[PDB]
Amino acid sequence: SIRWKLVSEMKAENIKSFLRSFTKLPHLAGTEQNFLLAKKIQTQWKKFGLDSAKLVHYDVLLSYPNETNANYISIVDEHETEIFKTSPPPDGYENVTNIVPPYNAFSAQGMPEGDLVYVNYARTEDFFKLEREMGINCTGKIVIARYGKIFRGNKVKNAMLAGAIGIILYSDPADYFAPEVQPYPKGWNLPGTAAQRGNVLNLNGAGDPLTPGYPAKEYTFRLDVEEGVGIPRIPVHPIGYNDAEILLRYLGGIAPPDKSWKGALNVSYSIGPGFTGSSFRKVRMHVYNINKITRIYNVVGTIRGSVEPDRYVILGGHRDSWVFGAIDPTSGVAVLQEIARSFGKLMSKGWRPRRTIIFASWDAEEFGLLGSTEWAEENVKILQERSIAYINSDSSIEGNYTLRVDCTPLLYQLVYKLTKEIPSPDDGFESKSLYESWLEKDPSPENKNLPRINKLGSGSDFEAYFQRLGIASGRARYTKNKKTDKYSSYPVYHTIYETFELVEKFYDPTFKKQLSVAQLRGALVYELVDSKIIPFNIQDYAEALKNYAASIYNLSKKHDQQLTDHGVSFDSLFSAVKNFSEAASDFHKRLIQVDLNNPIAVRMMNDQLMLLERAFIDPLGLPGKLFYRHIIFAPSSHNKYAGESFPGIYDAIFDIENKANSRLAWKEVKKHISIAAFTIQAAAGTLKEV
Amino acid sequence: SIRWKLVSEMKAENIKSFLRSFTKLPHLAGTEQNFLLAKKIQTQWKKFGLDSAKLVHYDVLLSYPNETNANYISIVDEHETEIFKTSPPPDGYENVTNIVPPYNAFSAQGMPEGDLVYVNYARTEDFFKLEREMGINCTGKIVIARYGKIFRGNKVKNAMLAGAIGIILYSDPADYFAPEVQPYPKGWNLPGTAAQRGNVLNLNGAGDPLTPGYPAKEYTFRLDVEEGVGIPRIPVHPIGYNDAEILLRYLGGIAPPDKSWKGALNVSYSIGPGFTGSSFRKVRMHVYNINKITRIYNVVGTIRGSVEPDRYVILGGHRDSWVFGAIDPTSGVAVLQEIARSFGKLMSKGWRPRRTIIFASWDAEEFGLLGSTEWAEENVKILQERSIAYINSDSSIEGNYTLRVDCTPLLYQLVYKLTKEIPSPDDGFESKSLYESWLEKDPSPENKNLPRINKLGSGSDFEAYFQRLGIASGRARYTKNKKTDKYSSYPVYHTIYETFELVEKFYDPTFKKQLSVAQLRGALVYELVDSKIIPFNIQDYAEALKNYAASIYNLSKKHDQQLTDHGVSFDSLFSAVKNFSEAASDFHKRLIQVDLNNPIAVRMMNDQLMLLERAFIDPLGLPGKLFYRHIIFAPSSHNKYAGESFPGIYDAIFDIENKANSRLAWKEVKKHISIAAFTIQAAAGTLKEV
Ligand SMILES: *[C@@H]1O[C@H](CO)[C@@H](O[C@@H]2O[C@H](CO)[C@@H](O)[C@H](O)[C@H]2NC(C)=O)[C@H](O)[C@H]1NC(C)=O
Ligand SMILES: *[C@@H]1O[C@H](CO)[C@@H](O[C@@H]2O[C@H](CO)[C@@H](O)[C@H](O)[C@H]2NC(C)=O)[C@H](O)[C@H]1NC(C)=O
Ligand SMILES: N[C@@H](CCP(=O)(O)C[C@@H](CCC(=O)O)C(=O)O)C(=O)O
Ligand SMILES: N[C@@H](CCP(=O)(O)C[C@@H](CCC(=O)O)C(=O)O)C(=O)O
Ligand SMILES: *[C@@H]1O[C@H](CO)[C@@H](O)[C@H](O)[C@H]1NC(C)=O
Ligand SMILES: *[C@@H]1O[C@H](CO)[C@@H](O)[C@H](O)[C@H]1NC(C)=O
Ligand SMILES: *[C@@H]1O[C@H](CO)[C@@H](O)[C@H](O)[C@H]1NC(C)=O
Ligand SMILES: *[C@@H]1O[C@H](CO)[C@@H](O)[C@H](O)[C@H]1NC(C)=O
Ligand SMILES: *[C@@H]1O[C@H](CO)[C@@H](O)[C@H](O)[C@H]1NC(C)=O
Ligand SMILES: *[C@@H]1O[C@H](CO)[C@@H](O)[C@H](O)[C@H]1NC(C)=O
Ligand SMILES: [Ca+2]
Ligand SMILES: [Ca+2]
Ligand SMILES: [Cl-]
Ligand SMILES: [Cl-]
Ligand SMILES: [Zn+2]
Ligand SMILES: [Zn+2]
Ligand SMILES: [Zn+2]
Ligand SMILES: [Zn+2]
């Protein structure tokens, strides 16, 4: 088959060669090297035989350290004397000059000074525990939080809400140092001198902070920088664990409340505020990063469909990194090139797809999904009426245990089908499929005989396509074993030590695991773009809605008396879900009857398949979040990396027992139950024959 | 042709018989008689042979007088003694019991007392003149305004902003008494005892006040009534001119400022506050209408398409009236029945349309477009992806001089084409077409060789379809001669005197003018639903955008120094308009080349024609107005009946010289210029081939 030709043409050695070629120098967004990498990708797509390959630019707010006013944290004594201050490229890269020092992009500027408080992971539950159980008031304090568990911008939002005047982020070995592995370069663990870069915005889907809603073109209106969406109002800076140990060692005050607050350093993990047993009197931060409008460049290419050129499947991945980014994103950049090359080989033998493929290399993803979101804002009118699906191509290889897939229920069946026809790259599975190894290693909690597929929140460039525009989206990559590996992300994430050599020595020396991910991403694009009937299954969406309705109802049971007292009922939601299940079953019964030789009959049913995900989009958005529009899924308000189901109801019920005004609070729950019931009923209505 | 069979089957005598049958009794929304009229329309559509005809209900907030606490206005002396108080069915209707007394639906309740001020038509410019030129402060006053010029809800919003505590509305003979015509029943003029009913909400497109965004179903969340959208916060009541003359006669204070403030009554038109020359000391209002959730019923029917059943042309008109409503809306109800009957006659000979026709009889239009807007909110997901156009069928006969058409530029060419093939009903034009008489009587200001077509604002049930959803819309009716007839609406508008006998004796005894309107509305539906290529012209939209851009730029010239000082430029708007004109020309050049025997080629271009109007819809809405989403048109903020072009820019520049903060004000102008330029460029992008 053509799909087998596409998959079998892809080669591990080619992914390895692309990865080495793209990882020799840092390629930070807005810098000359990441522009040169765009032009290189463009040249390659033209050689492969794509119909077009263009650079598409935007001018967006970025953030960088000031070379002549360096950031630091210090400890001062009562006489204002600095007692301590926080502070080469990896082997082989000694001549690389322009590695950006560690910083958190979009931190406020300032020099706050105060007592230090340790706040664990700075999650919502950690600040609840501090205030409600531990007697700690963070107002006016500098807080120190360990990285991990949730997106760092959520930590900063939480510290702002708790009244902190600054937040120090650090990498604790409990979370970034795998047991019995040596630090880089001898092993793949994080050294104590390395800090994790990353932005600390709270954009909620907005894209460029200065141009929410509209693409950042040269004529475009810009908000004043002080009103930029999502920009934090306190300083934020990241440090490695050698420096963190010095800051934590003499913290006094209360003992850590339980073992879940204690990391792995040889310190007490006492909470503060203040020091004991030391010259250590106050902590200071000094953070002076600069925000500036900077040009970014997406590469956008196409293969135009031969039958339905006005229908799109998008394969997009980011190219910008914090330093070399050999895993994030460049492993995905290398995969995207190998998929485009393979589609080019098909074209060289006369094939053309039924629908149009759009290939995209996004810029400034690490600064808030900026390039992919600005392009979605520019092209929203054609994208929302014509797109079948978005397949991401970020990091392919964050661990070497098994596959991880996150996607809409519409795509579950296609994912399972395609993984059965891709050889497993895993040791011990040499005559078995990827589906077989994935099922053995990560069975789904809700059905032991299927592999786990996760919900979509945010974290990568599919966000605007799925959460704002309602385009079916999916992602797949290799990952760690969650039952034995307790570290967050991977140890060297967003450090200088994400090098080609790390990937080849420690993650995937044969490049077979990366190859399996390229084969799956490419095969998904192929089936979505070439199949006469779009390969979605809406009965799988109906089953998912039944599970999500049971989950949100279960989370309401502990408030049963309040539900009765305030007249709150989930009956309309369960009725809408029942009606959707009936409509989805009836739709599939009619779909198998379609006359495949009648092009308008086929197109009308394909439009229903394409527009189903769109029915879940509410133009009014979610509360406070104009740009999260999907009623079934949104990024969690507590952790943008995680997807939450029925987000409007979930947020309305969360911590409701502590709301000041219970009558108002329960009316908000009733509002969002009503919106969810309407939206699912409306979606069911789009499937009806008459 | 089939179109000629549709048009020629329609008969004046049938429109007359329908109108007589629907106008014997009042048919106020939410009352038993208007439900009985729905079931009658349903029975008729089934007899005609429609595929379906269903009642679709919603429970929405309506407003009615309290039978046991009647409304009134009084004049009291300084001893609190009532000196004056404001206060049968038409001939032939003496036994009709349930005529609703005059009131303004959704008025606040209250009994304010104070000095009286005359505020002319209570337009924005009248309140500017009062405050800025005449030295009058309306704070704490009862104001009296004449009806006319603008929607009455705008008068009430303006009086609230000026600080009034109540507003009396009245019909001045200057505006509702045509010269040398006798009052009803001897002629068609307004008697001095009659008052005009009508709602006084400021909904801005929201629909039911309690359920903005979502259809008002039985499970639906409802706002608390005190938070209902658009509900005024002062009492409002309407009176006839015999009563108004008594209230105006002894007003003292300043003389009317110029003749444009003087109506036709034998009173001075002095402004107040206060009385002179009289026992007349203070005015009181007493208004106690009740707001209550009430069931309403739309009738929705279909003829399913034979080729593209998933594409819709909607023909909708309201059925509810204030009293008998023989003009508004029942002349349009009679027309809609005659069009449905004629389509049924086509079906009886074996015809079926290419696309689907949706017929709708809307309820509660007179209470804020409620039935049509709730149905749009219920069906938004299918409507926005599948609708070709909306054709209204409200009043057909508001005067007897010539045609009036209001529609999107997409429909100009079709309107002109069809009017050339409909016989003119006008005396003296017996061998000429309707186009010929319309052109002679109402030439367009921008092209003397075409009839005038107006922009769409609000005022009838097309509003949500066009302004919220971006579905091409049009309306047509017979109207008065504006160059000789200076009265607003028609004299008996919204009174008990809108009777069948009024229409037959004074407006259109032969029913030929009503017939010509039925023929045009039906022919528009037919061509939109049956033509292989949707009959829109996008180069006419390009020309319209050039005119609107020149108009908004011209309105900015008096601020030229401020444009320079604040760095405001219209360059991006003119560049987007140029790019749209090029894209529209290129689209039409490709459209004539389409292979008409290739169904997917045809469908792809029809999708571009259908989705063009949608490209102008911004889900973020206009400032303060979530439900007006069209960037090119919106109802005027000063008069919802009028359409305004580039509404976001217009409102940003309006009265800008009086804004407190000029830097902020000009930044808002720049924002809305940027949004308009983006939106037109995005719309141009939807026409591109690649
Ligand atoms: C699911 O579909 C059913 C059947 O159409 C809807 O049930 C109606 O519910 C209303 C109250 O909302 C009752 O007045 C009707 O009598 C019901 N008809 C039946 C049971 O045949 C139900 O409303 C739909 N669910 C939603 C959320 O729209
Ligand atoms: C209309 O189309 C033109 C041509 O594509 C656009 O012109 C570009 O304008 C930008 C500044 O916005 C310049 O950087 C380019 O050099 C222009 N290219 C030309 C003139 O070939 C113009 O931006 C479009 N208008 C809008 C509103 O998008
Ligand atoms: N592991 C995460 C993050 C991958 P990422 O590319 O590194 C994204 C980047 C920006 C996110 C944002 O601004 O919203 C960040 O998390 O710092 C995932 O896969 O989902
Ligand atoms: N002459 C006007 C009004 C016709 P209408 O049907 O009477 C509408 C009705 C309700 C309007 C509203 O609530 O927005 C009103 O104006 O009071 C027109 O044609 O456009
Ligand atoms: C960088 O810091 C130096 C020293 O404070 C300052 O003079 C300079 O203005 C800064 N650069 C920017 C772009 O703010
Ligand atoms: C938090 O501490 C600050 C100290 O300035 C104080 O204003 C506030 O009342 C305290 N709140 C709680 C819950 O202790
Ligand atoms: C890669 O897999 C090998 C073999 O199972 C294992 O020893 C190594 O730890 C894995 N690497 C990482 C980075 O997990
Ligand atoms: C009508 O007015 C009477 C007299 O004030 C009052 O008792 C009654 O409650 C009113 N009806 C409603 C529905 O408010
Ligand atoms: C309007 O009159 C009221 C009288 O109470 C007063 O509060 C306000 O200052 C006056 N404003 C103007 C512009 O005269
Ligand atoms: C109807 O037309 C006749 C003949 O021109 C005219 O005398 C009469 O005033 C018109 N009626 C109205 C209501 O305008
Ligand atoms: Ca933007
Ligand atoms: Ca509603
Ligand atoms: Cl990915
Ligand atoms: Cl109309
Ligand atoms: Zn990253
Ligand atoms: Zn990434
Ligand atoms: Zn009316
Ligand atoms: Zn009407």
Short mmCIF file of C-alpha atoms in Angstrom, two decimals, chain A residues 9-117:
data_model
loop_
_atom_site.label_atom_id
_atom_site.label_comp_id
_atom_site.label_asym_id
_atom_site.label_seq_id
_atom_site.Cartn_x
_atom_site.Cartn_y
_atom_site.Cartn_z
CA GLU A 9 10.86 4.73 3.28
CA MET A 10 11.60 6.49 6.59
CA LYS A 11 15.03 5.60 8.03
CA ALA A 12 16.55 5.83 11.49
CA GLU A 13 19.89 6.93 9.99
CA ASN A 14 18.22 9.85 8.25
CA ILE A 15 16.57 11.05 11.47
CA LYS A 16 20.00 10.80 13.13
CA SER A 17 21.68 12.82 10.38
CA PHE A 18 19.01 15.52 10.50
CA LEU A 19 19.24 15.71 14.30
CA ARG A 20 23.04 16.09 14.25
CA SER A 21 22.78 18.82 11.58
CA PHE A 22 20.28 20.90 13.58
CA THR A 23 21.86 20.66 17.04
CA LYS A 24 25.40 22.05 16.56
CA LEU A 25 24.54 25.56 17.76
CA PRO A 26 21.88 27.12 20.00
CA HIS A 27 18.72 28.11 18.16
CA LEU A 28 16.78 30.43 20.49
CA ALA A 29 13.73 32.16 19.05
CA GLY A 30 14.41 35.57 17.55
CA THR A 31 18.13 34.87 17.02
CA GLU A 32 20.04 34.64 13.77
CA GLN A 33 20.72 30.90 14.13
CA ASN A 34 17.04 30.02 14.41
CA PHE A 35 16.37 32.07 11.23
CA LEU A 36 19.15 30.19 9.48
CA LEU A 37 17.58 26.93 10.59
CA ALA A 38 14.25 28.09 9.11
CA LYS A 39 15.83 28.80 5.73
CA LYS A 40 17.56 25.41 5.83
CA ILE A 41 14.23 23.62 6.52
CA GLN A 42 12.68 25.66 3.68
CA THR A 43 15.47 24.67 1.24
CA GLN A 44 15.00 21.03 2.23
CA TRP A 45 11.21 21.10 1.70
CA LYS A 46 11.71 22.53 -1.76
CA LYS A 47 14.23 19.75 -2.56
CA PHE A 48 11.78 17.15 -1.28
CA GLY A 49 9.25 18.42 -3.84
CA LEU A 50 6.67 20.22 -1.72
CA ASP A 51 4.44 22.56 -3.73
CA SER A 52 5.39 25.53 -1.56
CA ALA A 53 7.65 26.39 1.35
CA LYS A 54 7.45 29.98 2.58
CA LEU A 55 8.67 31.93 5.57
CA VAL A 56 5.78 33.64 7.39
CA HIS A 57 6.87 36.24 9.95
CA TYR A 58 5.33 38.02 12.92
CA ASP A 59 6.71 40.69 15.34
CA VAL A 60 5.98 39.47 18.86
CA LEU A 61 7.07 40.31 22.39
CA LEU A 62 10.08 38.18 23.44
CA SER A 63 12.24 38.37 26.57
CA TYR A 64 15.99 37.98 27.07
CA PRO A 65 18.54 38.63 29.83
CA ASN A 66 20.39 41.92 29.75
CA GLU A 67 24.04 41.14 28.95
CA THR A 68 25.25 44.17 30.90
CA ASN A 69 22.99 43.77 33.97
CA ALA A 70 23.16 40.06 34.87
CA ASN A 71 20.52 38.34 36.99
CA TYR A 72 21.32 36.77 40.38
CA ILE A 73 20.01 35.86 43.80
CA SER A 74 22.00 36.78 46.91
CA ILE A 75 21.97 36.37 50.65
CA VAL A 76 22.84 39.47 52.68
CA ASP A 77 23.63 39.91 56.38
CA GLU A 78 22.14 42.57 58.62
CA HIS A 79 24.89 45.00 57.55
CA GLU A 80 23.89 44.69 53.90
CA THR A 81 26.99 42.68 53.05
CA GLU A 82 26.56 40.07 50.33
CA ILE A 83 27.46 36.71 51.80
CA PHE A 84 26.45 34.48 48.89
CA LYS A 85 25.52 34.96 45.25
CA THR A 86 24.02 32.39 42.86
CA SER A 87 25.93 31.80 39.61
CA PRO A 88 31.09 26.45 30.32
CA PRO A 89 29.38 24.86 27.35
CA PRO A 90 29.14 21.00 27.35
CA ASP A 91 32.20 18.99 26.24
CA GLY A 92 32.67 19.41 22.48
CA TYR A 93 30.96 22.81 22.43
CA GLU A 94 33.69 24.89 24.07
CA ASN A 95 33.72 27.38 21.21
CA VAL A 96 29.97 28.16 21.34
CA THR A 97 29.65 31.75 22.48
CA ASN A 98 25.96 32.66 22.60
CA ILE A 99 24.37 30.20 25.01
CA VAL A 100 21.66 32.21 26.81
CA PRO A 101 22.24 32.11 30.58
CA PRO A 102 19.51 30.63 32.76
CA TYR A 103 16.53 32.93 33.21
CA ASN A 104 12.73 32.80 33.17
CA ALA A 105 11.42 34.65 30.18
CA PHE A 106 8.89 37.41 30.96
CA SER A 107 9.86 37.69 34.65
CA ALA A 108 9.12 41.17 36.00
CA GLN A 109 12.18 43.35 36.71
CA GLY A 110 13.08 44.12 40.26
CA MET A 111 15.32 43.79 43.28
CA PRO A 112 13.05 42.54 46.06
CA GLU A 113 14.57 41.69 49.43
CA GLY A 114 12.91 39.81 52.24
CA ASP A 115 12.61 36.65 54.27
CA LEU A 116 12.62 33.34 52.42
CA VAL A 117 9.76 30.74 52.53
#
